Amino acid sequence: MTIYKLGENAPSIHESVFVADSATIVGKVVLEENASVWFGATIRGDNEPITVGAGSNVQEGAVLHTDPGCPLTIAPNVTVGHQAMLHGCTIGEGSLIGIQAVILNRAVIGRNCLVGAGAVITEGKAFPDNSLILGAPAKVVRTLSDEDIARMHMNTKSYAMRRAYFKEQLVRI
Amino acid sequence: MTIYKLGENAPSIHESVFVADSATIVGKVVLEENASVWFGATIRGDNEPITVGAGSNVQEGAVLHTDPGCPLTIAPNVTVGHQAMLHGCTIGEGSLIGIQAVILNRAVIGRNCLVGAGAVITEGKAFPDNSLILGAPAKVVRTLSDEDIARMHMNTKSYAMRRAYFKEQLVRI
Amino acid sequence: MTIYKLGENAPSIHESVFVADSATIVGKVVLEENASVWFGATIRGDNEPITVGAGSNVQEGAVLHTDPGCPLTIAPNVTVGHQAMLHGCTIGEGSLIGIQAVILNRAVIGRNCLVGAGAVITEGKAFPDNSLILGAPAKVVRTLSDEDIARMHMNTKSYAMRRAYFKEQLVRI
Ligand SMILES: [Zn+2]
Ligand SMILES: [Zn+2]
Ligand SMILES: [Zn+2]
């Protein structure tokens, strides 16, 4: 596997976590219960700590990094889509980060936000809870409905389930 | 290698296929004759089936996935560029998907289309044959010329050839 | 590791280089002193040669490729950010390529340029030294200040240092 200890800092991974063999986890990284990191994703905890909250998933090729003074915190029940890039930011509980979305240092995404695929959130930007954030540079286009939020959570919960399926039914050929 | 069987579903790969050691193939995936999947690419067939048509290539870091009710079908002679992301869509024969392009569920790209680098095709969008599709959200900017189409195909055919070269002349150091 | 010889062409890597185990280096590739290639990055030297200048870094998931007649040359002291894609272009000394930025064939980036995250530089575009290049298609928005340039270099130099730390303190778990 690609789980690495850097210096004296070794990842803290809950047993229930699914970490794909090609998912790189380095240094100061905390992966909470029911979280999952997929193929090709990389979580490099060499500067500030990086936390992936319980029930949260980090999909294929997503890259999580930080810079000094910019810890990366992903709250519980969050989906980080394929190829996304989170850099030293804060993601609120229940949010969904779209495919290839880019979020830079100091950015703060509130609870239940949906960041659109291909969006780019610049450094220091803050967004209120339940916001649909689209564009590059991204901005709040409107508030999400109960349905939007419920579908986002359904996807995230589905991944928390898929996690167990991959842990017990995935066999190399 | 990173070829995985998920549950009872194992990938169907034609012997002529080139699958890079770091290319992840999981579950319900069909890779037809002369297709090729490069380093870091991931094809996750855990929901709907994913088919890569004969003579088609999936370049470095591209990620192919689907959601229930949204199978991913890549027709023959198609090029999927580096870092692209295809999610539950349909790609017509002879097309070219640009670098980092993103195509979401239910999108349908006709035959001989060229999707520009960095474009974003939203869910459900459909585009006619021979279209040059650019933007995010992407749209048809104009019809491609015989030359445009011929150059696209030349690239794809070149990859079908490069496939054999890598299968027999690539040696780990 | 993922260092590959293609045909008769084998990578030329300076001993001081840090090459992550999952970093793919193939064929005609030259990695100069103090350069570093991170997890999931791929440098495919199967067409034209690809050179990574001394003290330059190629971050997670970045993909470097070329096409015939389009060599890829990355000058010394350059930072290529996470998930960037450089295709047959020329990057001037002291520059910084932002996260997920895409630069296509024949593009020329002068010395000390900063390409913004998510930008897309089309084929053949040329940009003068000390330019802040943003957008897709990207363009020069303004000249960088001494500070901007100095901070860019600080990041790149920091990576040249981090390189040694990973070479001696990174241990698989
Ligand atoms: Zn970083
Ligand atoms: Zn998906
Ligand atoms: Zn290429």
From TrEMBL, chains A, B, C:
It comes from the Bacteria. GO terms for molecular function: transferase activity. Pfam families: Hexapep. Keywords: Transferase. InterPro entries: Hexapep, LbH_gamma_CA-like, Transf_Hexapept/Carb_Anhydrase, Trimer_LpxA-like_sf. This is Bacterial transferase hexapeptide family protein. It comes from Burkholderia pseudomallei.
